[PDB]
Amino acid sequence: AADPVVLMETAFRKAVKSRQIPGAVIMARDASGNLNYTRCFGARTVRRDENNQLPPLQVDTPCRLASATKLLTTIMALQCMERGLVDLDETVDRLLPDLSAMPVLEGFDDAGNARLRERRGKITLRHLLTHTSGLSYVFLHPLLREYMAQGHLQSAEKFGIQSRLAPPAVNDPGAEWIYGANLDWAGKLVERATGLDLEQYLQENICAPLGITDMTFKLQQRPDMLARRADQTHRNSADGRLRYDCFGGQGVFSGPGSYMKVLHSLLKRDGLLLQPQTVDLMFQPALEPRLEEQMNQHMDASPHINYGGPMPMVLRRSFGLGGIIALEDLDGENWRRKGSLTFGGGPNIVWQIDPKAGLCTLAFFQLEPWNDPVCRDLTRTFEHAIYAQYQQG
User: Fold this and answer.
1) Between vectors from CA 248 to CA 77 and to CA 291, what angle results, nearest 5°?
2) Which amino acids does the record list as binding monacolin J?
3) Helix, strand, coil abundance in the chain, percent, nearest 5
4) Binding-site annotation: residue ranges
5) Helical H segments across 29-69, by residue range
6) What are the residues facing 361 on neighbouring strands?
7) In sequence order, what E strands does the chain have?
8) Burial 5-16 (b: 16+ CB within 10 A, else e)
9) Which of 58, 66, 107, 345 has the highest local Cβ count within 10 Å?
10) Rounded-to-integer distance, Cα 58 and Cα 373, Å
11) How far apart are the first and last CA of the chain?
């Protein structure tokens, strides 16, 4: 093992032992197939089992991907796009009339009543995949905040409208980049285009092709793996110490080893689940120029959120179909290169595909909250290390 890679590995092992993290599964791969690094650290929980030892996590251990599910759904949409069932620029309302029926919430008046408007513009699958549907998540936007305060979301029950799909848009399509629920609609679009719920579609069009068996939405229906799942860990603000704790877009449980397989096929054009042309698209910076600027501005101004994760807080980025795209070079030839596409999920799960560097890496944790200092620091120095040993050794 390389000078950086051994220092890195023991630096993880240090963090597990000094109770800073519970554990981590980390993984790197290259376009050749040939690079195959995969190392497990620590325990899958902090809560001791019946025998006073804590079972260790490993590549087959079931873990909540959480907000890292989105890529999978982003894939499943582009599968249908390929197969002719939809088209990126087709107005959603063919398959999602109920979405196209939703109004946009403009603002509030003085009596405080909800002020509401119909949508200028129209709304496409490309918009959804790029978080440019002009719709948002409830507790991130100040308007929806109060819409929620008034209790205008209560009424969805009457029309059988799913909780997550209920909130109104807060802008027109193509207007802003806004991290939003627009990946559960993506989930719907598929279900409706393929007459299949996305649990069935997932196994058929993603798991089967790569021979996966630990990927599922319905974990409660898998005694075999439910029993061995990873418990969630949460870190306290006071101490720094840690304590115990079917829509697309979030809520898949998978082994970290299997998630890699997916990142791999993509990296290496292998064509097993998607089609190299349409993969290239995912990596094409979708954001219009004035759009990509406001996104950068927003993301810089919100460091408490840190969509970037391990990568420099100030950076020039855009967005593609599945994640963020580093528009400039992260640190010369030492680290990620212009073109690389990263995203990640709640429990400090962070993946990235770098085509120009011929690599794809996946750091896998089960610790909340997002953007943890030790996780970020370890992820930082994880990538730094395998990038170095690999490409210059």
Assistant:
1) 65
2) 64, 164, 179, 368, 370
3) 40, 15, 45
4) 64, 164, 179, 346, 368, 370
5) none
6) 28, 352
7) 23-30, 36-42, 63-64, 104-108, 114-117, 233-235, 242-244, 253-254, 317-319, 324-326, 341-345, 349-354, 359-364, 367-368
8) beebbeebeebb
9) 345
10) 23
11) 10
Residue 304 carries which DSSP code?
T
* Other beta carbons less than 10 A from residue 104's beta carbon: 20
Neighbours of 94 (CB within 10 A): 13
- The catalytic site residues sit at 67
Annotated binding site for 2-methylbutanoate: 346
β-strands 324-326, 341-345: how paired? antiparallel
Half-sphere exposure (Cβ direction) of 339: Cα atoms closer than 13 Å: 13
The full set of domains in the chain, from first to last, is 1-393 (3.40.710.10)
What is the rounded CA–CA span in Å between residue 289 and residue 307? Answer: 20
- Amino acid at site 248: G
Closest C-alpha among 296, 366, 292 to residue 58: 366
* Spatial distance between the Cα atoms of 41 and 5, rounded to a whole number of angstroms: 14
Provide the token pair at 96: 């999602």
The string of DSSP letters for 110-137 reads SS-PEEEEPPSS--BHHHHHTT-SS---
Strand partners, 108: 114
Binding positions for monacolin J: 64, 164, 179, 368, 370
Which distant-in-sequence residues (6+ apart) come within 8 Å of 202 by Cβ? 72, 76, 215, 216, 217, 252
Q: Which two tokens stand for residue 90?
A: 């087709």
Give residue for tokens 């791969």: 29
Half-sphere exposure of 138 toward its Cβ, with a 13 Å CA cutoff? 14
